[PDB]
Amino acid sequence: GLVKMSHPSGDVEACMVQVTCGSMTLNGLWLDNTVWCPRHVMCPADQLSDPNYDALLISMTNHSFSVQKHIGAPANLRVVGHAMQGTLLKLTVDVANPSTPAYTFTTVKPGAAFSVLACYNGRPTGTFTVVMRPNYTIKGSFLCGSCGSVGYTKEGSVINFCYMHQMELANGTHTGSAFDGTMYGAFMDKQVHQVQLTDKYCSVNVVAWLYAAILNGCAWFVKPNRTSVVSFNEWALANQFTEFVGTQSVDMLAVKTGVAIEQLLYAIQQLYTGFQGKQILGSTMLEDEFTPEDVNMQIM
Amino acid sequence: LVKMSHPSGDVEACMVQVTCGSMTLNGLWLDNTVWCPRHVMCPADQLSDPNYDALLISMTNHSFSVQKHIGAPANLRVVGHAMQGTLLKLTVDVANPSTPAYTFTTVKPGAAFSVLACYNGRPTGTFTVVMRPNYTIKGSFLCGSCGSVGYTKEGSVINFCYMHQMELANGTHTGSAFDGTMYGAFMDKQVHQVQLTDKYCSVNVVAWLYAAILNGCAWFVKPNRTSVVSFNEWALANQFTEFVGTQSVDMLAVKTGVAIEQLLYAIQQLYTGFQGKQILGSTMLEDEFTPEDVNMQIM
Numbered sequence: 179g180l181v182k183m184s185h186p187s188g189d190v191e192a193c194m195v196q197v198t199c200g201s202m203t204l205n206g207l208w209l210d211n212t213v214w215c216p217r218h219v220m221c222p223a224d225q226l227s228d229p230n231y232d233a234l235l236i237s238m239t240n241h242s243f244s245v246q247k248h249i250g251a252p253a254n255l256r257v258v259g260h261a262m263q264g265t266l267l268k269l270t271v272d273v274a275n276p277s278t279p280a281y282t283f284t285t286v287k288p289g290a291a292f293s294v295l296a297c298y299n300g301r302p303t304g305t306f307t308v309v310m311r312p313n314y315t316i317k318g319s320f321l322c323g324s325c326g327s328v329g330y331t332k333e334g335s336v337i338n339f340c341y342m343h344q345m346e347l348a349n350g351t352h353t354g355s356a357f358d359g360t361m362y363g364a365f366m367d368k369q370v371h372q373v374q375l376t377d378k379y380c381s382v383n384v385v386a387w388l389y390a391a392i393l394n395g396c397a398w399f400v401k402p403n404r405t406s407v408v409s410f411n412e413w414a415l416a417n418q419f420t421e422f423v424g425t426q427s428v429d430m431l432a433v434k435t436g437v438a439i440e441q442l443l444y445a446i447q448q449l450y451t452g453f454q455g456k457q458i459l460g461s462t463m464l465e466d467e468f469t470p471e472d473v474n475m476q477i478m
Numbered sequence: 479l480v481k482m483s484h485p486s487g488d489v490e491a492c493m494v495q496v497t498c499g500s501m502t503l504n505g506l507w508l509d510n511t512v513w514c515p516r517h518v519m520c521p522a523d524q525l526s527d528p529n530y531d532a533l534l535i536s537m538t539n540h541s542f543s544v545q546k547h548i549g550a551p552a553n554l555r556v557v558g559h560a561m562q563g564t565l566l567k568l569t570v571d572v573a574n575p576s577t578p579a580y581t582f583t584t585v586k587p588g589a590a591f592s593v594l595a596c597y598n599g600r601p602t603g604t605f606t607v608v609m610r611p612n613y614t615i616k617g618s619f620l621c622g623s624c625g626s627v628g629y630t631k632e633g634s635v636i637n638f639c640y641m642h643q644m645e646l647a648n649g650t651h652t653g654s655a656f657d658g659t660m661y662g663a664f665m666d667k668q669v670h671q672v673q674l675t676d677k678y679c680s681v682n683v684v685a686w687l688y689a690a691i692l693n694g695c696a697w698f699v700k701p702n703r704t705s706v707v708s709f710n711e712w713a714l715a716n717q718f719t720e721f722v723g724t725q726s727v728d729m730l731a732v733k734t735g736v737a738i739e740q741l742l743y744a745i746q747q748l749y750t751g752f753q754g755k756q757i758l759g760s761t762m763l764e765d766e767f768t769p770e771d772v773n774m775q776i777m
C-alpha cells in the first residue's frame with residue numbers, strides 16, 4: 179500500500195522562471211527579489227570544458243541576464259544585481275515575487291527524500307520524488323534543458339528548498355546544488371567526465387520498508403534473532419550499507435508492530451544474502467526508497 | 479525510469495471542502511459546478527445501504543456548505559443540486575476564476591494518470607497510478623481523501639478522469655469517472671465487495687521491455703516471434719490483458735528495430751521465470767510504465 183508520494187507542486191510552480199545569458203538558457207527559482215539559477219549559465223558552450231567563473235562573473239553585467247515568467251501571472255522581469263555563490267548565481271530583480279511561499283534552505287542528508295519539479299524553459303512539466311543516495315547523487319528523470327529545476331520538502335507551510343539540478347553523470351544518475359551554492363558530492367560543474375563513489379543501501383529506509391511489510395501481514399522474515407545497532411553498523415561498513423541511525427519516527431513504527439529495530443537489523447543481514455525466491459511487498463531486493471516518515475504518514 | 483505525475487497547481491486551484499450535516503469530503507470546483515461523491519448526503523450510520531434517491535429529495539437550499547481553503551479563501555453559496563451517477567453535481571453562484579480548459583474522458587486499464595490527494599479540501603500529496611485491468615488502483619488514500627481527483631494533461635487541457643470514493647480489502651481503491659459511473663461498477667455503499675482478479679497489462683510490459691533494450695539490456699530478444707492474435711488467446715489463460723498496439727508502441731519498435739512480436743514471444747517465456755537473469759534490476763515483469771512514459775523519459 180506504498181506509493182511514491184510528492185508534495186503538491188503548486189507553491190513551487192509559482193516560482194519557476196527562465197534565465198538567459200547570451201544564447202545559453204536554463205531554469206531559475208524566483209523568491210522575493212532574488213532569482214537563483216546555476217552559474218554555468220554564463221559560460222559559452224566552448225568554455226564549458228574548463229570554465230573560469232571568477233572571470234565570467236566580472237566580465238558579466240546585469241544586461242547579460244534576462245529573466246522571463248512564462249506561466250500563470252506573466253511578468254516584466256528586470257535584473258538589478260548579481261552575485262555568484264558556490265555553483266549558484268544570485269541575481270536580484272526589482273519586483274518581489276508575490277507568490278513567494280514560506281521557505282528555508284536546508285541541505286539534505288543521504289537517505290532522506292524530497293520532491294523535485296522537472297522544468298524546461300521555466301515551464302514545469304512533471305513532478306516526482308527521489309531520495310538522496312549515499313553517493314550524493316539522485317536517480318531522477320532529467321532531460322536536455324532541465325538544469326535549474328528544484329528539489330523541495332515541506333513541513334507545515336514552510337517549503338524547505340534543498341536541491342537545484344545541474345548535471346548528468348553515467349546513465350540516469352543526477353546531482354546538483356544545495357542553495358548555499360555547494361554541489362552535493364563535491365562534483366565539478368564542468369563538462370569533464372567524473373566518477374561517482376559507490377552507492378550504499380540506506381539502512382534506515384530498509385528498516386522502515388520491512389516495518390511497512392509487517393504492517394501489511396508480510397512478516398515471514400521476522401525471527402526472534404536480533405543484531406544490535408552497534409554490531410550492525412560494523413557489519414554494515416563491509417557490505418555496502420549505511421550506518422543505521424535510529425529516529426523517533428522509527429520508534430513509532432517499532433511500537434505499533436511490537437517488532438524491535440534489532441530484530442529487523444538481523445533480518446537485513448540474512449535477506450541481503452538472498453530472498454531464496456520469496457517476496458516482501460512484491461519484491462526480491464531490499465527496498466530503500468521509502469523513509470520511516472513515509473511509512474508513518476502512508477500506513478498511519 | 480521514475481514514476482512521474484503532472485504538475486498539480488492547476489488542479490490544486492480547484493479543490494474544495496464539501497460538508498453535508500455530519501459528513502465531509504473533497505470536491506472539484508470548475509465554472510459554477512462543484513463535483514463531489516454523492517455519499518456526503520448519507521449520514522455516517524446509514525451507509526450500509528442508502529437510498530440516495532430519498533436522501534437527495536430530503537435536501538434543502540442550505541444542505542451543503544462549501545469552502546475553499548487555498549488561494550483566495552471563500553465560502554460559496556450553492557444554488558442548485560443535481561445528481562448524476564455516483565456523483566453530486568452542485569451548482570454555485572460563483573464561477574471558479576482559476577478554471578482551466580478541461581475534458582472528462584474515462585480512462586481504460588493500463589493507462590496512467592496523476593492523482594492529487596486531499597483531506598478537508600486541502601492538497602497534501604500527488605502521485606501517479608495506472609488503472610488496473612480489474613478497474614482498481616494501487617494508491618495511498620486515508621480517511622477523508624474521498625473526492626480527491628485523478629487527471630491527465632493533453633497540452634494545457636486537464637483531462638479529469640477519476641474522483642476517489644472507496645477502499646476495498648487491503649489498499650486497492652476505486653472511484654468514478656466524471657460521467658458518474660464507478661470503475662468496475664463497485665457500489666458507493668458500505669458493504670464488502672469482491673474485486674475481480676487482476677491481470678498483467680500486456681502493453682505496458684512490451685513498453686517496459688523496450689525500455690530495457692534502450693538502456694542496453696537486450697539479452698532476452700531472440701528471432702522467434704509470437705503474433706498478437708496468438709498472444710491474446712494465450713493471454714486469456716495466463717492472467718494477461720489482450721495486446722492493443724499504438725502509435726506510441728510503434729515509436730519504440732522503430733528506434734530499437736525490435737518487433738512487437740519478438741517481445742510478445744519474449745513475454746511468453748519470461749512469464750515463467752527469469753532463469754536467474756535480471757532486467758533493469760528486476761525479477762518479475764513490470765507493467766506500470768506506459769509506452770508514452772518510455773517515449774518521454776528515454777527521449
Ligand SMILES: COc1cccc2[nH]c(C(=O)N[C@@H](CC(C)C)C(=O)N[C@@H](C[C@@H]3CCNC3=O)C(=O)COP(=O)(O)O)cc12
Pocket residue numbers: 503517525526619620621622623624625642643644645646647651665666667668669670671
Ligand atoms: C462497508 O464495509 C466495508 C467493508 C470493506 C471495505 C470497505 N470500504 C468501505 C469504504 O471505503 N467506504 C467509503 C464510503 C462508502 C460509503 C462508499 C469510504 O469511507 N471512503 C473514504 C475513502 C477511503 C477511506 C479509507 N481510504 C479511502 O480511500 C472516503 O474518502 C471518506 O473517508 P472517511 O469515511 O472519513 O474514512 C466500506 C467497506
